[PDB]
Amino acid sequence: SYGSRIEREQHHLIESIEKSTQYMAKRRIGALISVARDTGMDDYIETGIPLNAKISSQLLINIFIPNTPLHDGAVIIKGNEIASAASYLPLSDSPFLSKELGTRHRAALGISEVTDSITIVVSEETGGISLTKGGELFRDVSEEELHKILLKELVTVTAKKPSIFSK
Protein backbone atom coordinates (compact mmCIF):
# COMPACT_ATOMS: atom_id res chain seq x y z
CA SER A 1 0.00 0.00 0.00
CA TYR A 2 3.08 2.20 0.48
CA GLY A 3 6.41 0.93 -0.82
CA SER A 4 7.39 -2.66 -1.49
CA ARG A 5 9.66 -5.36 -0.07
CA ILE A 6 12.77 -6.09 -2.14
CA GLU A 7 12.62 -9.85 -1.46
CA ARG A 8 9.02 -10.03 -2.65
CA GLU A 9 9.89 -8.06 -5.80
CA GLN A 10 12.83 -10.31 -6.66
CA HIS A 11 10.88 -13.54 -6.17
CA HIS A 12 7.97 -12.14 -8.19
CA LEU A 13 10.44 -11.26 -10.96
CA ILE A 14 11.79 -14.82 -11.13
CA GLU A 15 8.32 -16.34 -11.02
CA SER A 16 7.17 -14.01 -13.81
CA ILE A 17 10.13 -14.96 -15.97
CA GLU A 18 9.67 -18.70 -15.35
CA LYS A 19 5.95 -18.69 -16.13
CA SER A 20 6.21 -16.56 -19.27
CA THR A 21 9.19 -18.42 -20.80
CA GLN A 22 7.52 -21.77 -20.06
CA TYR A 23 4.35 -20.53 -21.79
CA MET A 24 6.31 -19.32 -24.81
CA ALA A 25 8.57 -22.38 -24.95
CA LYS A 26 5.61 -24.78 -25.29
CA ARG A 27 4.28 -22.67 -28.16
CA ARG A 28 7.71 -22.04 -29.82
CA ILE A 29 7.40 -18.26 -29.46
CA GLY A 30 10.79 -16.52 -29.65
CA ALA A 31 11.60 -14.27 -26.70
CA LEU A 32 14.56 -12.20 -25.45
CA ILE A 33 14.50 -10.81 -21.88
CA SER A 34 17.52 -9.03 -20.39
CA VAL A 35 17.58 -8.23 -16.65
CA ALA A 36 19.78 -5.29 -15.71
CA ARG A 37 21.96 -5.58 -12.64
CA ASP A 38 24.89 -3.44 -11.46
CA THR A 39 25.65 -2.33 -15.02
CA GLY A 40 23.72 0.52 -16.57
CA MET A 41 21.71 -0.65 -19.55
CA ASP A 42 20.17 2.79 -19.96
CA ASP A 43 21.56 3.20 -23.51
CA TYR A 44 19.78 0.05 -24.66
CA ILE A 45 16.51 0.93 -22.91
CA GLU A 46 16.47 4.16 -24.90
CA THR A 47 16.44 2.16 -28.16
CA GLY A 48 13.12 0.48 -27.43
CA ILE A 49 9.52 1.48 -26.85
CA PRO A 50 9.32 2.64 -23.21
CA LEU A 51 6.83 0.79 -21.03
CA ASN A 52 7.93 1.32 -17.40
CA ALA A 53 5.34 -1.35 -16.58
CA LYS A 54 4.73 -3.56 -13.56
CA ILE A 55 6.27 -6.97 -14.16
CA SER A 56 3.87 -9.84 -14.79
CA SER A 57 4.01 -13.11 -16.69
CA GLN A 58 0.94 -11.99 -18.69
CA LEU A 59 2.49 -8.77 -19.97
CA LEU A 60 5.70 -10.56 -20.88
CA ILE A 61 3.71 -13.11 -22.89
CA ASN A 62 1.67 -10.46 -24.72
CA ILE A 63 4.85 -8.56 -25.61
CA PHE A 64 6.36 -11.45 -27.62
CA ILE A 65 3.30 -12.49 -29.67
CA PRO A 66 4.72 -12.73 -33.23
CA ASN A 67 3.89 -10.09 -35.87
CA THR A 68 3.02 -7.50 -33.19
CA PRO A 69 4.63 -4.09 -32.66
CA LEU A 70 6.46 -5.01 -29.46
CA HIS A 71 7.86 -8.46 -30.30
CA ASP A 72 10.81 -7.46 -32.53
CA GLY A 73 13.70 -7.09 -30.12
CA ALA A 74 14.55 -7.36 -26.44
CA VAL A 75 12.59 -6.68 -23.30
CA ILE A 76 14.82 -4.96 -20.73
CA ILE A 77 13.86 -5.25 -17.06
CA LYS A 78 15.38 -2.63 -14.78
CA GLY A 79 14.62 -2.17 -11.14
CA ASN A 80 11.15 -3.54 -10.59
CA GLU A 81 9.81 -2.58 -14.01
CA ILE A 82 9.67 -3.77 -17.55
CA ALA A 83 11.46 -0.67 -18.80
CA SER A 84 11.30 -1.19 -22.57
CA ALA A 85 10.37 -3.63 -25.31
CA ALA A 86 11.62 -4.05 -28.87
CA SER A 87 15.06 -2.83 -27.73
CA TYR A 88 18.34 -3.32 -29.55
CA LEU A 89 21.09 -5.43 -28.00
CA PRO A 90 24.56 -5.72 -29.57
CA LEU A 91 25.45 -8.96 -31.36
CA SER A 92 28.44 -10.99 -30.24
CA ASP A 93 31.06 -11.57 -32.91
CA SER A 94 32.12 -14.84 -31.26
CA PRO A 95 32.90 -17.64 -33.73
CA PHE A 96 32.39 -20.15 -30.90
CA LEU A 97 28.62 -19.64 -30.78
CA SER A 98 27.07 -22.50 -32.74
CA LYS A 99 25.57 -21.61 -36.12
CA GLU A 100 22.49 -23.71 -35.24
CA LEU A 101 21.49 -20.82 -32.96
CA GLY A 102 19.61 -17.67 -33.92
CA THR A 103 20.17 -13.96 -33.78
CA ARG A 104 18.34 -13.73 -30.43
CA HIS A 105 21.09 -15.94 -28.97
CA ARG A 106 23.79 -13.78 -30.57
CA ALA A 107 22.19 -10.67 -29.07
CA ALA A 108 21.91 -12.31 -25.64
CA LEU A 109 25.59 -13.30 -25.85
CA GLY A 110 26.58 -9.83 -27.01
CA ILE A 111 24.96 -7.98 -24.14
CA SER A 112 26.36 -10.53 -21.69
CA GLU A 113 29.86 -9.59 -22.82
CA VAL A 114 29.64 -5.87 -21.99
CA THR A 115 27.25 -5.85 -19.00
CA ASP A 116 26.63 -7.99 -15.94
CA SER A 117 23.06 -8.45 -17.06
CA ILE A 118 21.27 -11.81 -17.18
CA THR A 119 19.52 -12.56 -20.44
CA ILE A 120 16.99 -15.31 -21.17
CA VAL A 121 16.17 -16.50 -24.68
CA VAL A 122 13.36 -18.69 -25.95
CA SER A 123 14.11 -20.14 -29.37
CA GLU A 124 11.44 -19.60 -32.02
CA GLU A 125 12.89 -22.67 -33.75
CA THR A 126 12.95 -25.25 -30.95
CA GLY A 127 11.32 -23.80 -27.84
CA GLY A 128 14.59 -24.38 -25.97
CA ILE A 129 15.32 -21.90 -23.19
CA SER A 130 18.84 -20.47 -22.87
CA LEU A 131 20.60 -17.93 -20.64
CA THR A 132 23.69 -15.80 -20.97
CA LYS A 133 25.82 -14.08 -18.37
CA GLY A 134 29.39 -12.81 -18.57
CA GLY A 135 30.03 -13.92 -22.14
CA GLU A 136 28.84 -17.49 -21.44
CA LEU A 137 25.86 -19.35 -22.90
CA PHE A 138 23.82 -21.92 -20.96
CA ARG A 139 22.08 -23.72 -23.79
CA ASP A 140 18.70 -25.51 -23.69
CA VAL A 141 18.35 -25.52 -19.91
CA SER A 142 15.76 -27.48 -17.97
CA GLU A 143 13.12 -25.73 -15.88
CA GLU A 144 14.92 -26.77 -12.67
CA GLU A 145 18.20 -25.38 -14.06
CA LEU A 146 16.52 -22.13 -15.12
CA HIS A 147 14.97 -21.81 -11.65
CA LYS A 148 18.27 -22.33 -9.84
CA ILE A 149 20.30 -19.92 -12.00
CA LEU A 150 17.61 -17.24 -11.67
CA LEU A 151 17.48 -17.82 -7.92
CA LYS A 152 21.26 -17.63 -7.60
CA GLU A 153 21.71 -14.57 -9.82
CA LEU A 154 18.63 -12.40 -9.19
CA VAL A 155 17.72 -12.69 -5.47
CA THR A 156 20.15 -10.80 -3.21
CA VAL A 157 18.32 -11.12 0.13
CA THR A 158 18.06 -14.14 2.40
CA ALA A 159 15.35 -14.77 5.03
CA LYS A 160 15.18 -11.48 6.96
CA LYS A 161 12.51 -9.20 8.40
CA PRO A 162 10.32 -7.81 5.58
CA SER A 163 10.32 -4.01 5.43
CA ILE A 164 9.46 -1.42 2.78
CA PHE A 165 12.70 0.36 3.71
CA SER A 166 15.37 -2.32 3.13
CA LYS A 167 15.71 -1.66 -0.64
Binding site listing for ATP: 72, 89, 102-105, 123-125
Contact status, residue 153 vs residue 133, Cβ threshold 8 Å: yes
Among 1, 7, 8, 85, binds Cl ion (CB under 5 A): 8
Rule CB under 5 A: is residue 160 a binding residue for Cl ion?
Answer: no
Contact status, residue 128 vs residue 140, Cβ threshold 8 Å: yes
Least distance CB 127 / Cl ion (angstroms): 33
Contact status, residue 50 vs residue 40, Cβ threshold 8 Å: no
Task: Return the range that interacts with Cl ion (CB under 5 A); candidates 7-15, 42-50, 99-107, 117-125.
Answer: 7-15
- Please give the single-letter amino acid code of residue 32: L
Contact status, residue 48 vs residue 88, Cβ threshold 8 Å: yes
Task: Return the range that interacts with Cl ion (CB under 5 A); candidates 6-14, 50-58, 90-98, 109-117.
Answer: 6-14
Binding-site members are 72, 89, 102-105, 123-125
